[PDB]
PDB file of all heavy atoms in Angstrom:
ATOM      1  N   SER A   1      -0.616  20.363  -0.650  1.00 31.83           N
ATOM      2  CA  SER A   1      -0.839  19.275  -1.583  1.00 31.83           C
ATOM      3  C   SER A   1       0.440  18.478  -1.802  1.00 31.83           C
ATOM      4  O   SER A   1       0.388  17.383  -2.396  1.00 31.83           O
ATOM      5  CB  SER A   1      -1.335  19.823  -2.941  1.00 31.83           C
ATOM      6  OG  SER A   1      -0.324  20.575  -3.580  1.00 31.83           O
ATOM      7  N   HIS A   2       1.592  19.006  -1.332  1.00 28.85           N
ATOM      8  CA  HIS A   2       2.823  18.233  -1.339  1.00 28.85           C
ATOM      9  C   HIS A   2       2.668  16.990  -0.443  1.00 28.85           C
ATOM     10  O   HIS A   2       3.254  15.951  -0.779  1.00 28.85           O
ATOM     11  CB  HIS A   2       3.970  19.110  -0.859  1.00 28.85           C
ATOM     12  CG  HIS A   2       5.311  18.452  -0.887  1.00 28.85           C
ATOM     13  ND1 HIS A   2       5.834  17.851  -2.021  1.00 28.85           N
ATOM     14  CD2 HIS A   2       6.250  18.289   0.088  1.00 28.85           C
ATOM     15  CE1 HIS A   2       7.012  17.365  -1.744  1.00 28.85           C
ATOM     16  NE2 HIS A   2       7.288  17.592  -0.483  1.00 28.85           N
ATOM     17  N   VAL A   3       1.952  17.117   0.649  1.00 26.04           N
ATOM     18  CA  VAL A   3       1.729  15.992   1.551  1.00 26.04           C
ATOM     19  C   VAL A   3       0.913  14.882   0.832  1.00 26.04           C
ATOM     20  O   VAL A   3       1.212  13.699   0.947  1.00 26.04           O
ATOM     21  CB  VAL A   3       1.047  16.443   2.854  1.00 26.04           C
ATOM     22  CG1 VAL A   3       0.251  15.295   3.487  1.00 26.04           C
ATOM     23  CG2 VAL A   3       2.102  16.953   3.831  1.00 26.04           C
ATOM     24  N   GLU A   4      -0.119  15.335   0.078  1.00 24.99           N
ATOM     25  CA  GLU A   4      -0.925  14.347  -0.631  1.00 24.99           C
ATOM     26  C   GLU A   4      -0.085  13.614  -1.698  1.00 24.99           C
ATOM     27  O   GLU A   4      -0.172  12.403  -1.865  1.00 24.99           O
ATOM     28  CB  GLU A   4      -2.121  15.043  -1.303  1.00 24.99           C
ATOM     29  CG  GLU A   4      -3.190  15.470  -0.320  1.00 24.99           C
ATOM     30  CD  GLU A   4      -4.436  15.948  -0.993  1.00 24.99           C
ATOM     31  OE1 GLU A   4      -4.349  16.819  -1.892  1.00 24.99           O
ATOM     32  OE2 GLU A   4      -5.551  15.443  -0.651  1.00 24.99           O
ATOM     33  N   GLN A   5       0.764  14.375  -2.421  1.00 22.13           N
ATOM     34  CA  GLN A   5       1.668  13.753  -3.374  1.00 22.13           C
ATOM     35  C   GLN A   5       2.701  12.903  -2.687  1.00 22.13           C
ATOM     36  O   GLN A   5       3.244  11.987  -3.322  1.00 22.13           O
ATOM     37  CB  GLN A   5       2.364  14.838  -4.231  1.00 22.13           C
ATOM     38  CG  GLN A   5       2.855  14.399  -5.566  1.00 22.13           C
ATOM     39  CD  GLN A   5       3.452  15.535  -6.391  1.00 22.13           C
ATOM     40  OE1 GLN A   5       3.258  16.684  -6.066  1.00 22.13           O
ATOM     41  NE2 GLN A   5       4.182  15.179  -7.436  1.00 22.13           N
ATOM     42  N   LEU A   6       2.981  13.140  -1.413  1.00 23.34           N
ATOM     43  CA  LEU A   6       3.938  12.299  -0.683  1.00 23.34           C
ATOM     44  C   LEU A   6       3.226  11.063  -0.110  1.00 23.34           C
ATOM     45  O   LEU A   6       3.794   9.951  -0.159  1.00 23.34           O
ATOM     46  CB  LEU A   6       4.553  13.106   0.470  1.00 23.34           C
ATOM     47  CG  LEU A   6       5.662  14.112   0.084  1.00 23.34           C
ATOM     48  CD1 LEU A   6       6.020  14.949   1.318  1.00 23.34           C
ATOM     49  CD2 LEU A   6       6.872  13.398  -0.474  1.00 23.34           C
ATOM     50  N   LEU A   7       2.018  11.225   0.398  1.00 22.91           N
ATOM     51  CA  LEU A   7       1.221  10.087   0.925  1.00 22.91           C
ATOM     52  C   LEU A   7       0.853   9.116  -0.141  1.00 22.91           C
ATOM     53  O   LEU A   7       0.409   7.976   0.225  1.00 22.91           O
ATOM     54  CB  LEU A   7       0.009  10.596   1.698  1.00 22.91           C
ATOM     55  CG  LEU A   7       0.266  11.289   3.021  1.00 22.91           C
ATOM     56  CD1 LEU A   7      -1.062  11.746   3.617  1.00 22.91           C
ATOM     57  CD2 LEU A   7       0.985  10.346   3.973  1.00 22.91           C
ATOM     58  N   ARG A   8       0.942   9.475  -1.400  1.00 23.73           N
ATOM     59  CA  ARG A   8       0.566   8.556  -2.489  1.00 23.73           C
ATOM     60  C   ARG A   8       1.381   7.276  -2.456  1.00 23.73           C
ATOM     61  O   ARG A   8       0.884   6.215  -2.768  1.00 23.73           O
ATOM     62  CB  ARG A   8       0.723   9.279  -3.820  1.00 23.73           C
ATOM     63  CG  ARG A   8       0.129   8.559  -5.029  1.00 23.73           C
ATOM     64  CD  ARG A   8       0.217   9.429  -6.280  1.00 23.73           C
ATOM     65  NE  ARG A   8      -0.138   8.703  -7.472  1.00 23.73           N
ATOM     66  CZ  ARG A   8       0.702   7.991  -8.197  1.00 23.73           C
ATOM     67  NH1 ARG A   8       1.970   7.878  -7.821  1.00 23.73           N
ATOM     68  NH2 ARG A   8       0.289   7.336  -9.276  1.00 23.73           N
ATOM     69  N   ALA A   9       2.670   7.410  -2.074  1.00 22.93           N
ATOM     70  CA  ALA A   9       3.538   6.224  -2.124  1.00 22.93           C
ATOM     71  C   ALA A   9       3.143   5.173  -1.104  1.00 22.93           C
ATOM     72  O   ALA A   9       3.382   3.972  -1.324  1.00 22.93           O
ATOM     73  CB  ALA A   9       4.996   6.644  -1.865  1.00 22.93           C
ATOM     74  N   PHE A  10       2.569   5.572   0.040  1.00 23.76           N
ATOM     75  CA  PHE A  10       2.135   4.593   1.057  1.00 23.76           C
ATOM     76  C   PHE A  10       0.986   3.764   0.522  1.00 23.76           C
ATOM     77  O   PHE A  10       0.943   2.549   0.790  1.00 23.76           O
ATOM     78  CB  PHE A  10       1.815   5.301   2.350  1.00 23.76           C
ATOM     79  CG  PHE A  10       2.999   5.643   3.228  1.00 23.76           C
ATOM     80  CD1 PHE A  10       3.723   6.777   2.971  1.00 23.76           C
ATOM     81  CD2 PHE A  10       3.367   4.784   4.276  1.00 23.76           C
ATOM     82  CE1 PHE A  10       4.800   7.099   3.770  1.00 23.76           C
ATOM     83  CE2 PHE A  10       4.450   5.077   5.043  1.00 23.76           C
ATOM     84  CZ  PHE A  10       5.201   6.233   4.784  1.00 23.76           C
ATOM     85  N   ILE A  11       0.023   4.408  -0.162  1.00 24.88           N
ATOM     86  CA  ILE A  11      -1.076   3.665  -0.770  1.00 24.88           C
ATOM     87  C   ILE A  11      -0.600   2.682  -1.821  1.00 24.88           C
ATOM     88  O   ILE A  11      -1.021   1.568  -1.868  1.00 24.88           O
ATOM     89  CB  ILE A  11      -2.150   4.628  -1.285  1.00 24.88           C
ATOM     90  CG1 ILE A  11      -2.700   5.495  -0.149  1.00 24.88           C
ATOM     91  CG2 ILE A  11      -3.252   3.881  -1.965  1.00 24.88           C
ATOM     92  CD1 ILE A  11      -3.795   6.434  -0.595  1.00 24.88           C
ATOM     93  N   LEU A  12       0.358   3.184  -2.663  1.00 26.21           N
ATOM     94  CA  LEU A  12       0.901   2.304  -3.679  1.00 26.21           C
ATOM     95  C   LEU A  12       1.661   1.130  -3.074  1.00 26.21           C
ATOM     96  O   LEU A  12       1.653   0.031  -3.627  1.00 26.21           O
ATOM     97  CB  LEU A  12       1.826   3.094  -4.604  1.00 26.21           C
ATOM     98  CG  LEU A  12       1.173   4.244  -5.383  1.00 26.21           C
ATOM     99  CD1 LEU A  12       2.225   5.127  -5.987  1.00 26.21           C
ATOM    100  CD2 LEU A  12       0.244   3.686  -6.448  1.00 26.21           C
ATOM    101  N   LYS A  13       2.282   1.336  -1.891  1.00 28.26           N
ATOM    102  CA  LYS A  13       2.982   0.244  -1.242  1.00 28.26           C
ATOM    103  C   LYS A  13       2.020  -0.702  -0.580  1.00 28.26           C
ATOM    104  O   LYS A  13       2.286  -1.908  -0.485  1.00 28.26           O
ATOM    105  CB  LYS A  13       3.931   0.822  -0.204  1.00 28.26           C
ATOM    106  CG  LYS A  13       5.434   0.736  -0.589  1.00 28.26           C
ATOM    107  CD  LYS A  13       5.821  -0.731  -0.777  1.00 28.26           C
ATOM    108  CE  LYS A  13       7.305  -0.834  -1.092  1.00 28.26           C
ATOM    109  NZ  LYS A  13       7.670   0.039  -2.224  1.00 28.26           N
ATOM    110  N   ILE A  14       0.836  -0.224  -0.149  1.00 28.70           N
ATOM    111  CA  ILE A  14      -0.154  -1.140   0.445  1.00 28.70           C
ATOM    112  C   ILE A  14      -0.726  -2.068  -0.625  1.00 28.70           C
ATOM    113  O   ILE A  14      -1.114  -3.196  -0.284  1.00 28.70           O
ATOM    114  CB  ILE A  14      -1.261  -0.318   1.160  1.00 28.70           C
ATOM    115  CG1 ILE A  14      -0.704   0.403   2.373  1.00 28.70           C
ATOM    116  CG2 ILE A  14      -2.404  -1.199   1.601  1.00 28.70           C
ATOM    117  CD1 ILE A  14      -0.386  -0.506   3.505  1.00 28.70           C
ATOM    118  N   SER A  15      -0.712  -1.679  -1.879  1.00 28.52           N
ATOM    119  CA  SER A  15      -1.276  -2.499  -2.932  1.00 28.52           C
ATOM    120  C   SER A  15      -0.453  -3.736  -3.220  1.00 28.52           C
ATOM    121  O   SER A  15      -0.990  -4.786  -3.539  1.00 28.52           O
ATOM    122  CB  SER A  15      -1.444  -1.678  -4.213  1.00 28.52           C
ATOM    123  OG  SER A  15      -0.175  -1.263  -4.702  1.00 28.52           O
ATOM    124  N   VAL A  16       0.890  -3.647  -3.087  1.00 30.67           N
ATOM    125  CA  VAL A  16       1.738  -4.811  -3.307  1.00 30.67           C
ATOM    126  C   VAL A  16       1.691  -5.818  -2.193  1.00 30.67           C
ATOM    127  O   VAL A  16       2.356  -6.851  -2.260  1.00 30.67           O
ATOM    128  CB  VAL A  16       3.199  -4.397  -3.590  1.00 30.67           C
ATOM    129  CG1 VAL A  16       3.249  -3.316  -4.630  1.00 30.67           C
ATOM    130  CG2 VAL A  16       3.846  -3.927  -2.278  1.00 30.67           C
ATOM    131  N   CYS A  17       0.901  -5.544  -1.122  1.00 31.37           N
ATOM    132  CA  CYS A  17       0.765  -6.488  -0.026  1.00 31.37           C
ATOM    133  C   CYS A  17       0.136  -7.791  -0.469  1.00 31.37           C
ATOM    134  O   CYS A  17       0.357  -8.865   0.125  1.00 31.37           O
ATOM    135  CB  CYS A  17      -0.033  -5.916   1.130  1.00 31.37           C
ATOM    136  SG  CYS A  17       0.776  -4.513   1.925  1.00 31.37           S
ATOM    137  N   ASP A  18      -0.698  -7.754  -1.538  1.00 33.24           N
ATOM    138  CA  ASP A  18      -1.204  -8.976  -2.135  1.00 33.24           C
ATOM    139  C   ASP A  18      -0.092  -9.877  -2.655  1.00 33.24           C
ATOM    140  O   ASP A  18      -0.308 -11.106  -2.767  1.00 33.24           O
ATOM    141  CB  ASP A  18      -2.166  -8.622  -3.295  1.00 33.24           C
ATOM    142  CG  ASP A  18      -2.995  -9.797  -3.755  1.00 33.24           C
ATOM    143  OD1 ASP A  18      -2.997 -10.870  -3.065  1.00 33.24           O
ATOM    144  OD2 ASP A  18      -3.600  -9.686  -4.835  1.00 33.24           O
ATOM    145  N   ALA A  19       1.072  -9.315  -2.961  1.00 34.12           N
ATOM    146  CA  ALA A  19       2.167 -10.074  -3.572  1.00 34.12           C
ATOM    147  C   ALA A  19       3.235 -10.532  -2.572  1.00 34.12           C
ATOM    148  O   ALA A  19       3.991 -11.426  -2.860  1.00 34.12           O
ATOM    149  CB  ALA A  19       2.839  -9.262  -4.660  1.00 34.12           C
ATOM    150  N   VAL A  20       3.261  -9.937  -1.384  1.00 30.34           N
ATOM    151  CA  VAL A  20       4.314 -10.231  -0.398  1.00 30.34           C
ATOM    152  C   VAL A  20       3.826 -11.041   0.777  1.00 30.34           C
ATOM    153  O   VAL A  20       4.625 -11.710   1.430  1.00 30.34           O
ATOM    154  CB  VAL A  20       4.974  -8.931   0.091  1.00 30.34           C
ATOM    155  CG1 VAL A  20       6.209  -9.216   0.905  1.00 30.34           C
ATOM    156  CG2 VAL A  20       5.305  -8.030  -1.104  1.00 30.34           C
ATOM    157  N   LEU A  21       2.510 -11.051   1.062  1.00 29.79           N
ATOM    158  CA  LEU A  21       1.956 -11.789   2.171  1.00 29.79           C
ATOM    159  C   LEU A  21       1.198 -13.022   1.676  1.00 29.79           C
ATOM    160  O   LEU A  21       0.541 -12.992   0.625  1.00 29.79           O
ATOM    161  CB  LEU A  21       1.018 -10.924   3.020  1.00 29.79           C
ATOM    162  CG  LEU A  21       1.601  -9.768   3.823  1.00 29.79           C
ATOM    163  CD1 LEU A  21       2.919 -10.095   4.461  1.00 29.79           C
ATOM    164  CD2 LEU A  21       1.752  -8.520   2.908  1.00 29.79           C
ATOM    165  N   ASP A  22       1.265 -14.112   2.439  1.00 28.15           N
ATOM    166  CA  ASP A  22       0.489 -15.286   2.133  1.00 28.15           C
ATOM    167  C   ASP A  22      -0.984 -15.020   2.387  1.00 28.15           C
ATOM    168  O   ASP A  22      -1.350 -14.267   3.293  1.00 28.15           O
ATOM    169  CB  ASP A  22       0.970 -16.488   2.955  1.00 28.15           C
ATOM    170  CG  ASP A  22       2.483 -16.688   2.857  1.00 28.15           C
ATOM    171  OD1 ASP A  22       3.070 -16.307   1.810  1.00 28.15           O
ATOM    172  OD2 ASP A  22       3.051 -17.236   3.805  1.00 28.15           O
ATOM    173  N   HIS A  23      -1.844 -15.657   1.633  1.00 30.75           N
ATOM    174  CA  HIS A  23      -3.284 -15.416   1.727  1.00 30.75           C
ATOM    175  C   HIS A  23      -3.798 -15.795   3.091  1.00 30.75           C
ATOM    176  O   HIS A  23      -3.439 -16.841   3.673  1.00 30.75           O
ATOM    177  CB  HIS A  23      -4.043 -16.204   0.636  1.00 30.75           C
ATOM    178  CG  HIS A  23      -3.881 -15.643  -0.745  1.00 30.75           C
ATOM    179  ND1 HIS A  23      -2.759 -15.880  -1.504  1.00 30.75           N
ATOM    180  CD2 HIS A  23      -4.677 -14.844  -1.468  1.00 30.75           C
ATOM    181  CE1 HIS A  23      -2.859 -15.281  -2.659  1.00 30.75           C
ATOM    182  NE2 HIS A  23      -4.033 -14.634  -2.671  1.00 30.75           N
ATOM    183  N   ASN A  24      -4.625 -14.925   3.669  1.00 34.73           N
ATOM    184  CA  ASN A  24      -5.130 -15.125   5.023  1.00 34.73           C
ATOM    185  C   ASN A  24      -6.155 -16.274   5.084  1.00 34.73           C
ATOM    186  O   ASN A  24      -6.737 -16.616   4.079  1.00 34.73           O
ATOM    187  CB  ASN A  24      -5.793 -13.851   5.538  1.00 34.73           C
ATOM    188  CG  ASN A  24      -4.783 -12.709   5.688  1.00 34.73           C
ATOM    189  OD1 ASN A  24      -3.602 -12.919   5.996  1.00 34.73           O
ATOM    190  ND2 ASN A  24      -5.260 -11.477   5.472  1.00 34.73           N
ATOM    191  N   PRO A  25      -6.346 -16.850   6.249  1.00 35.82           N
ATOM    192  CA  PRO A  25      -7.391 -17.836   6.411  1.00 35.82           C
ATOM    193  C   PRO A  25      -8.769 -17.186   6.216  1.00 35.82           C
ATOM    194  O   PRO A  25      -8.890 -15.976   6.371  1.00 35.82           O
ATOM    195  CB  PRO A  25      -7.223 -18.339   7.870  1.00 35.82           C
ATOM    196  CG  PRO A  25      -5.805 -18.048   8.181  1.00 35.82           C
ATOM    197  CD  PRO A  25      -5.460 -16.779   7.453  1.00 35.82           C
ATOM    198  N   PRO A  26      -9.758 -17.982   5.850  1.00 37.28           N
ATOM    199  CA  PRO A  26     -11.095 -17.411   5.653  1.00 37.28           C
ATOM    200  C   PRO A  26     -11.747 -17.013   6.953  1.00 37.28           C
ATOM    201  O   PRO A  26     -11.498 -17.602   8.022  1.00 37.28           O
ATOM    202  CB  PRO A  26     -11.906 -18.526   4.944  1.00 37.28           C
ATOM    203  CG  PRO A  26     -11.191 -19.770   5.437  1.00 37.28           C
ATOM    204  CD  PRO A  26      -9.745 -19.428   5.538  1.00 37.28           C
ATOM    205  N   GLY A  27     -12.618 -16.020   6.913  1.00 35.89           N
ATOM    206  CA  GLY A  27     -13.366 -15.611   8.086  1.00 35.89           C
ATOM    207  C   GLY A  27     -12.584 -14.748   9.051  1.00 35.89           C
ATOM    208  O   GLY A  27     -12.933 -14.729  10.261  1.00 35.89           O
TER     209      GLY A  27
END
């Protein structure tokens, strides 16, 4: 379960991608 507590940070980092990348084209 240490791995799960470690992998948590990658998911939290994926969430801020809305703030660092420009919005994609539609479709």
